[PDB]
Amino acid sequence: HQFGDDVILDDVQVSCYRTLCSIYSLGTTKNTYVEKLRPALGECLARLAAAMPVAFLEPQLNEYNACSVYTTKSPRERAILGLPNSVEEMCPDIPVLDRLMADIGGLAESGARYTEMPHVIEITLPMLCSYLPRWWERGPEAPPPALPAGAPPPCTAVTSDHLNSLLGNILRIIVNNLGIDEATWMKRLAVFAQPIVSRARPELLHSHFIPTIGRLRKRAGKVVAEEEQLRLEAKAEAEEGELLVRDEFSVLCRDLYALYPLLIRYVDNNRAHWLTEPNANAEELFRMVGEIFIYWSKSHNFKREEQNFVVQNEINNMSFLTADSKSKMARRGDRYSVQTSLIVATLKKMLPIGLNMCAPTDQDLIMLAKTRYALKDTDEEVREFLQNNLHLQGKVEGSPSLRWQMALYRGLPGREEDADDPEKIVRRVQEVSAVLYHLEQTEHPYKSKKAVWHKLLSKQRRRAVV
Amino acid sequence: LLLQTNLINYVTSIRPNIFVGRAEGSTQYGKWYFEVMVDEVVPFLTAQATHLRVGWALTEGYSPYPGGGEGWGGNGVGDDLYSYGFDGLHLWTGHVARPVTSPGQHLLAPEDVVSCCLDLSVPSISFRINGCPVQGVFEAFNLDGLFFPVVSFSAGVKVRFLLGGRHGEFKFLPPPGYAPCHEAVLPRERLRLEPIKEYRREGPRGPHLVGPSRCLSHTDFVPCPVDTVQIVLPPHLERIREKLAENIHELWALTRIEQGWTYGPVRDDNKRLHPCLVNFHSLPEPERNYNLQMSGETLKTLLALGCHVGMADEKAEDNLKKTKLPKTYMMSNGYKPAPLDLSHVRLTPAQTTLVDRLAENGHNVWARDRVAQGWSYSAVQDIPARRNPRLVPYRLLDEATKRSNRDSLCQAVRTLLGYGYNIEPPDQEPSQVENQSRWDRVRIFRAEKSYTVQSGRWYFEFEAVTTGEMRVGWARPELRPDVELGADELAYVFNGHRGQRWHLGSEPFGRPWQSGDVVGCMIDLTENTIIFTLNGEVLMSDSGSETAFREIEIGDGFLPVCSLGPGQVGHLNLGQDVSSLRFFAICGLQEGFEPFAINMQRPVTTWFSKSLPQFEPVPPEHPHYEVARMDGTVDTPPCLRLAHRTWGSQNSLVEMLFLRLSLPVQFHQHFRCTDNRDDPEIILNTTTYYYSVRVFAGQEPSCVWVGWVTPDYHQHDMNFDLSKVRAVTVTMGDEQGNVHSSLKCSNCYMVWGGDFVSPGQQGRISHTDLVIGCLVDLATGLMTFTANGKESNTFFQVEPNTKLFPAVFVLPTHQNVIQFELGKQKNIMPLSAAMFLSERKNPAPQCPPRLEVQMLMPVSWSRMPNHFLQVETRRAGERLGWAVQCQDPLTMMALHIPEENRC
């Protein structure tokens, strides 16, 4: 409710400084009590950073800020109540913003794990994720009205570059710590990092996201290969290794539920531009998410481990999907639903890119490839089928709607008819057909109504077990 | 009997933004003058003759809509009782042309100057042609609203408005006491030429749909300061008041000094200086007196508001910190009266709003005092003539004077606080003006029912130029114009003023738009869902739903629909040009939605809700009103009875009902020069016809009006009384007085039942049933009334060819209200004879099926013309004035209903 400026003014500010600096000072020590305690402290710290009107990280520019004890109170005052006489001396233990960002970088490029930088991940990063947006709104790059713009110099120096660098470093940390068995901090860091993604620059995609999703896709593929071999060989030892593949599934689903909930937002803001001007990186991201969705659909275990992760970790996912409603400011389905699944949500978000890849003419071949997938024809088999039936491509003169669709298709700068080649066409038809296929089974699984459970029999048999 | 077809040219009306009226306590000058000069006229650009009329029109009720209208169309000045016009040869009012005599008579031609004069006092409207008097006047017309200059034209016209001063130069001297219309130009507004009640205007990308305009009322100019008669003044509030009087006087004097005013032995306006400057005593007493009355009005106003005032701190009351004027400054006086310091005093936002309200009241009090003195408003200041630019209520006042009166009064409040009198405002109470009904305020634009879709996936866009009340969505073909969109099952709509979605009520959904935002509406009949997007992003409920509405039934079909509130502008794109769509590719194209008009050679035809009330047959299933046709008996004639189904029940609707019979009686073209057994020859040769209305017992006659209405009646007033009735008198006379003719024309002729009733302030309830009889002589054009067989004083005279419908206006007070009794008095024919040719000589009363009761419905669906006249408006020059040009013809085939005389 943006009450901080009015509320936290003099003595509430003093108390907030004391709380802030105590929580930050707590970082150095290592204890089991501290480890179990940190997440609540970091959450409180983030909320306090968001609410606090002063920019404690950027003190040198405090003289501009009006909502500060130093400006409000005369030097005669502040002698009655002990002060250092300098907002810098407040509490020096907290480093400046540039220093902290440099530290987080250095750690991320070094490859530090959670054990080396547990204080940062649990406490500092949420504080920065809360600080940088609020002060970006009040800082340069804010939409300035003429008078407020000309008179006071902004206290904050925050810019979108800070947020972009922080997001890249966070993704770097996650990629460093993907493989580890125990990463509980992932969900909390992702939730805290959601806000800053809005200001992420386009280059972040190619720089960070594509490699991350590619690595996750490779890991998924290895895991499915192990699952296929395990199904091929039937033994009690085959029942052994089920545990291994499920543990791999669970850690993989943890990595995905860490990474995608950030990406979905990045996609939402950049989807319009990707559709307006086609982007090869966007197409490749669609390919990765589609491959992961195919693995999800084919592997029974992967779905169950996703579901177990969601239920045990109480991940609602409604905040990830709908949080923009919160920013704009006006149960088993809520627990787990396939709609909630971040895999299908991300695939549906990126699907328009895949559809834009395919020209309107390719719809007929797409349908044929979907039928072949229903015949269970493999990737190469649908490819050769498309080679055989390439001539079938739809007729612009024959169809009226295809006329204007294809007119728009040329209207796109990146899409030219001369550039298209048979191999490109058959490939994109194959990809879109596989995605649409598996999406149709996901959307209508038929698991419901296959064996209806009115549980009248279960009730009648409760008396029987009695 | 048969519908008639003919080709008619379109007509358009242009006015300046001058609005003048008369009201008690009004700030407005009564007499006004303007001119129109004809540069070019093409008599016959089409087969139909060119249209050019100049006149005055009333803000309320002058709603000329393109194409269809009264008579054969071409609605302009004088085609309604609200407008009064001159064509060069005739004076037009009520769609009647009355020839008027002028030297060198001719239809308006190039190089002709028409001078129009309005005297609200009489009231009278007069014309001069090329400086030569026009021997006819409009008088005795209604003053319910403001008056504005107007020209109505077809294509083939170039004319210029001359409004005086810098906006045009008059070729002929205005008659004495008549102000040029440019003087009426208001502070907050600049002079312009605008269309009247437009629902459409051309835009850069495409046409904009426009909501109803917000128009001022003649009451608005009347200041209404809060009453200060009941006042109790504490003694310390008496002297303190004088203290602030002198304090504000001194502060204002100094302020004038800092702005540079000096001392003058004499005073003058342009000079900018005031003689009081010299000392707070030495200044004249009348200034002190004036400041004292207003200082008291301040305290009395605080009391009237009821804010609690109390002496907070005796220490500050006893000791007053004194500002010291800067020593550096030097003044002819040499001595400055030190006011209290303003810096130490603090004001809260509530005090700021109180300051605004008190400044409003003070300015309104000043305006009332000046009005009592006889001052009036004028954009140009003439002290000798008592015309001031600032003599306008605070709302219409300009921002600069608003700020000056603000600031002064906030410093006055800080002075009170410096004395220490703490003031606590009372809680604010919301109020709803309801100056205009939802009916007129809301316009609905929908696609034509031919374009209804019962299948597929469709997309269309709506751009919001304004951020105010507008709704966009999909509607069923049987959408009722009356209902606000989405209140009923008929519409599936989204309202971004508040971020709501409407179907059978309102639920929060999405986010409110901002100016320039585009709403993409998509309907998927295959999945039976509706989706809304804003600027390319899907709107979400207070939930994860991507769909505003679900499980929709296809039924008859769906249509695109939008609704605009007053002062709202939208742009509707149905996809005839796919490139025009901004956000279609971002959302909808890949999903496969097709634009509503993707393959259409012609733009989609639209229909809009039109607020003109028209008579429609009472629905058989109308929940509240029932009409029963009774057969004639030996004792009783045939009758049509009205009953209230839901009377004496929760949800009962009690409101004014305007009813008329379907078929009229027509007066003869040429008026004749100069036992109870009917006499055959008398009854056969009589031109007199009769009907009666029986008001039942329990139905208050005071709530009933009986008589006739002309087809042009369109006035749907909840607070109806005979005063609201339109009326105007056309007077034609010789060059030297000697009035040849005076004709009174009105749309409604009626008698109030309270006139007939014997006084019943005591014993008001009457078991007896009242029976009001209406008689008309077609040959003499005379109309008379009978109370219970007793002749009433009221009588009317009408011109030949007049059509009159039996009409009853009633406020129900009982389940059984009225009967239209179609019967005959001895030696008088019933209405059947007059209505039907075959029955002209049949005295036997009859009620055929065609004769039916019709109730007034305020709003109706009206087609939007595919093409509209292109009018060029400019300012040719300071001397030339403003210029209006139409050159490209438009014609429409018009279907004419003869009985209703409408097209």
Q: B755: burial class by Cβ within 10 Å (0-12, 13-18, 19+)?
A: middle
- Neighboring chain B residues of A328 at a CB cutoff of 8 Å: 511
Q: A148: burial class by Cβ within 10 Å (0-12, 13-18, 19+)?
A: exposed
First-to-last CA distance in chain A? 57
**Which residue among A268, A276, A339 places its CB closest to the CB of B585?**
A276
Please tell me the total number of residues recorded for chain A in this structure.
466
**Which residue among A268, A275, A321 places its CB closest to the CB of B585?**
A275
Distance of CA A407 to the CA centre of its chain: 35
Kindly determine whether residue A325 and residue B579, on different chains, have CB atoms separated by under 8 Å: no
- Neighboring chain A residues of B543 at a CB cutoff of 8 Å: 322
Q: What is the dihedral of CA B342, B346, B347, B348, to 10 degrees?
A: 170
* Cross-strand pairs, B559: B475
Give CA–CA dist A417/B44, Å, rounded. 56
- B621: its two tokens: 């299933």
- Neighboring chain A residues of B536 at a CB cutoff of 8 Å: 272
Give CA–CA dist B472/B461, Å, rounded. 9
Segment (H or E) for B816: strand B816-821
- What are the C-alpha distances in Å from B578 to residues A361, A362, B570, B761, B774? 19, 21, 19, 71, 63
Give CA–CA dist B138/A291, Å, rounded. 84
* Cross-strand pairs, B797: B782
Kindly determine whether residue B598 and residue A401, on different chains, have CB atoms separated by under 8 Å: yes
- Amino acid, res. B849: P
- Neighboring chain B residues of A330 at a CB cutoff of 8 Å: 499, 508, 511, 542
- Total CB pairs under 8 A between chain A and B: 43
**Which residue among A276, A328, A352 places its CB closest to the CB of B511?**
A328
Inter-residue contact B199 to B566 (CB < 8 Å): no
Peptide bond into B326 cis (omega under 30): no
Kindly determine whether residue A339 and residue B578, on different chains, have CB atoms separated by under 8 Å: no
Q: Which string of b and e fits B27-51 if b means at least 16 CB within 10 Å?
A: bbbbbbbbbbbbbebeeebbebebb
- Neighboring chain A residues of B456 at a CB cutoff of 8 Å: none
- What are the C-alpha distances in Å from B345 to residues B316, B410, B424? 11, 11, 15
Residue bearing tokens 């011109």:
B799
Give CA–CA dist B903/B900, Å, rounded. 9
Shortest CA gap B399–chain A (Å): 19
Best A6, A322, A329, A402 member to test B by mutation, with max B CBs in 10 Å, is A322
**Which residue among B508, B544, B586 places its CB closest to the CB of A272?**
B586
Interface of B with A (CB under 8 A): 499, 508, 511, 536-537, 540, 542-544, 578-579, 583, 585-586, 589-591, 594, 598-599
Interface of A with B (CB under 8 A): 268, 271-272, 275-276, 318, 321-322, 324-325, 328, 330, 339-340, 351-352, 355-356, 400-401, 404, 407-408, 411
- B42: its two tokens: 């093409």
How crowded is residue B134: how many other Cβ atoms within 10 Å of its Cβ?
A: 21
**Please, after which residues is chain B broken with C–N above 2.5 Å?**
674
Shortest CA gap B433–chain A (Å): 28
* Closest to A272 in 3D by CA, of A202, A190, A319, A171: A202
Give CA–CA dist B686/B671, Å, rounded. 13
Shortest CA gap B600–chain A (Å): 12
Kindly determine whether residue B585 and residue A408, on different chains, have CB atoms separated by under 8 Å: yes
Q: Which string of b and e fits A36-54 if b means at least 16 CB within 10 Å?
A: eebeebbbbbbebbbbbbb
Give CA–CA dist B274/B506, Å, rounded. 61
Resolution for this PDB entry, in angstroms = 2.7
Shortest CA gap B495–chain A (Å): 13
Contacts of B223 (CB under 8 A, 6+ apart): B25, B27, B363, B364, B365, B367, B368, B371, B393
Contacts of A280 (CB under 8 A, 6+ apart): none
| Alpha-helical runs (H) found in B232-284 | 235-259
How crowded is residue A259: how many other Cβ atoms within 10 Å of its Cβ?
A: 22
- Neighboring chain B residues of A400 at a CB cutoff of 8 Å: 599
DSSP symbol at A206? I
Task: Return contacts of A454-458, CB within 8 angstroms, 24+ apart.
Answer: none
- B308: its two tokens: 């609690």
DSSP symbol at B172? S
Residue of B nearest to A271 (CA): B586
Give CA–CA dist B83/B726, Å, rounded. 11
- What are the C-alpha distances in Å from B142 to residues B60, B146, B467? 11, 10, 37
- Neighboring chain A residues of B458 at a CB cutoff of 8 Å: none
Residue of B nearest to A408 (CA): B579
Give CA–CA dist B798/B794, Å, rounded. 14
DSSP symbol at B175? P
* Closest to A447 in 3D by CA, of A290, A302, A338: A338
- A463: its two tokens: 């008396």
Contacts of A215 (CB under 8 A, 6+ apart): A175, A178
Residue of B nearest to A354 (CA): B590
Segment (H or E) for B470: strand B470-475
- What are the C-alpha distances in Å from B622 to residues A83, B207, B756? 79, 38, 31
Kindly determine whether residue B540 and residue A322, on different chains, have CB atoms separated by under 8 Å: yes
- Amino acid, res. B627: V
Q: B319: burial class by Cβ within 10 Å (0-12, 13-18, 19+)?
A: exposed
Distance of CA A75 to the CA centre of its chain: 48
- B854: its two tokens: 């019709």
- B141: its two tokens: 């017309």
How crowded is residue B200: how many other Cβ atoms within 10 Å of its Cβ?
A: 17
Residue of A nearest to B575 (CA): A404
Q: Which string of b and e fits B663-695 if b means at least 16 CB within 10 Å?
A: bbbbbeeebeeeeeebeeeebeebbbbbbbbbb
Q: B121: burial class by Cβ within 10 Å (0-12, 13-18, 19+)?
A: exposed
Kindly determine whether residue B590 and residue A355, on different chains, have CB atoms separated by under 8 Å: yes
Kindly determine whether residue B589 and residue A408, on different chains, have CB atoms separated by under 8 Å: yes
Give CA–CA dist B118/B230, Å, rounded. 41
- A178: its two tokens: 């993907």
- Amino acid, res. B243: K
Inter-residue contact A330 to B510 (CB < 8 Å): no
**Which residue among A318, A352, A404 places its CB closest to the CB of B544?**
A318
- A337: its two tokens: 């639903």
Query: Within 13 A of A445's CA, how many CA atoms are on the CB side?
Result: 13
Please tell me the total number of residues recorded for chain B in this structure.
903
Give CA–CA dist A108/B206, Å, rounded. 54
Query: Within 13 A of B262's CA, how many CA atoms are on the CB side?
Result: 6
* Cross-strand pairs, B445: B562, B608
- Amino acid, res. B190: R
Kindly determine whether residue A330 and residue B537, on different chains, have CB atoms separated by under 8 Å: no
* Closest to A140 in 3D by CA, of A126, A159, A124, A123: A159
Give CA–CA dist B570/B763, Å, rounded. 57
Best B543, B545, B601 member to test A by mutation, with max A CBs in 10 Å, is B543
**Which residue among A318, A330, A407 places its CB closest to the CB of B499?**
A330
Give CA–CA dist A89/B594, Å, rounded. 64
Give CA–CA dist B99/B84, Å, rounded. 14
* Closest to B466 in 3D by CA, of B215, B216, B201: B201
* Closest to A379 in 3D by CA, of A442, A287, A282, A281: A287
Shortest CA gap A392–chain B (Å): 21
Shortest CA gap B511–chain A (Å): 6
DSSP symbol at A142? S
- Neighboring chain A residues of B550 at a CB cutoff of 8 Å: none
How crowded is residue A375: how many other Cβ atoms within 10 Å of its Cβ?
A: 10
What are the respective helix, strand and coil percentages of chain A, to the nearest 5?
70, 0, 30
Best B534, B535, B578 member to test A by mutation, with max A CBs in 10 Å, is B578
What does the H/E/C string look like for B819-849? EEECCCCCCCEEHHHHHCCCCCCCCCCCCCC
Q: What is the dihedral of CA B275, B279, B280, B282, to 10 degrees?
A: -70
Question: What sign results for the dihedral spanned by CA atoms B896, B898, B899, B901?
Answer: positive
- DSSP assignment of A375-392, as one string? TT--HHHHHHHHHHTGGG
What does the H/E/C string look like for B285-321? HHHHHHHHHHHHHHHHHHHHHCCEEEECCHHHHHCCC
- What are the C-alpha distances in Å from B712 to residues B79, B288, B894? 9, 59, 18
Inter-residue contact B27 to B67 (CB < 8 Å): no
Query: Within 13 A of A103's CA, how many CA atoms are on the CB side?
Result: 15
Query: Within 13 A of A358's CA, how many CA atoms are on the CB side?
Result: 29
* Closest to A289 in 3D by CA, of A216, A191, A357: A216
**Residue A456, phi-psi category: left (phi > 0), alpha (psi -120 to 50), beta (remainder):** alpha
- DSSP assignment of A27-72, as one string? TS---HHHHHHHHHHHHHHHHHHHH-SS-SSS-TTGGG-SSSHHHH
Kindly determine whether residue A276 and residue B543, on different chains, have CB atoms separated by under 8 Å: no
- DSSP assignment of B728-795, as one string? EEEEEE-SSS-EEEEEEE-SEEEEEHHHHSPP-SSS---SSPEEEEEEEETTTTEEEEESSSSEEEEE
Q: Which string of b and e fits A394-404 if b means at least 16 CB within 10 Å?
A: bebeeeeebeb
Q: Which string of b and e fits B573-591 if b means at least 16 CB within 10 Å?
A: bbbbebeebebbbbbbbbe
Best A404, A410, A435, A436 member to test B by mutation, with max B CBs in 10 Å, is A404
Kindly determine whether residue A404 and residue B578, on different chains, have CB atoms separated by under 8 Å: yes
- Neighboring chain A residues of B591 at a CB cutoff of 8 Å: 352
Kindly determine whether residue B544 and residue A328, on different chains, have CB atoms separated by under 8 Å: no
* Closest to B510 in 3D by CA, of B549, B539, B542: B539
- Neighboring chain A residues of B507 at a CB cutoff of 8 Å: none
- B709: its two tokens: 């209405």
Best B537, B539, B550, B580 member to test A by mutation, with max A CBs in 10 Å, is B537
* Closest to B835 in 3D by CA, of B804, B875, B879: B804
Q: Which string of b and e fits B758-772 if b means at least 16 CB within 10 Å?
A: eeeeeeeeeeebbbb
Phi first, then psi: give them for residue B138, nearest 5 degrees.
Answer: -95, 135
Give CA–CA dist B52/B158, Å, rounded. 10
Kindly determine whether residue B590 and residue A356, on different chains, have CB atoms separated by under 8 Å: yes
Segment (H or E) for B7: strand B4-9
Give CA–CA dist A38/A117, Å, rounded. 13
Phi first, then psi: give them for residue B7, nearest 5 degrees.
Answer: -90, 130
- What are the C-alpha distances in Å from B836 to residues B639, B833, B842, B877? 17, 6, 10, 60
